[PDB]
Symmetry: none
């Protein structure tokens, strides 16, 4: 008959790098 | 008679994209 | 009669945080 289950599969690959952050806010009025 | 354990499972799915970077620092005062 | 595949691998790690955003622009002169 069939044997028992095999081992876990491989862990998934790490995801893509996040997008760069937005520009900071305008500085205060002069 | 029972055969051997089975093979590894399927890999995990790829991770999601990282978080957006933080905003940059305020610009200089005007 | 090797057995079935095992369980799915671990879900992948989330990606690296994005890089910091650029400095903001100078404030208004006014």
């Amino acid at each position: 008959p069939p044997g028992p289950p095999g081992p876990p599969g491989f862990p998934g690959m790490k995801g893509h790098r996040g997008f760069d952050g937005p520009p900071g806010p305008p500085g205060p009025p002069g």
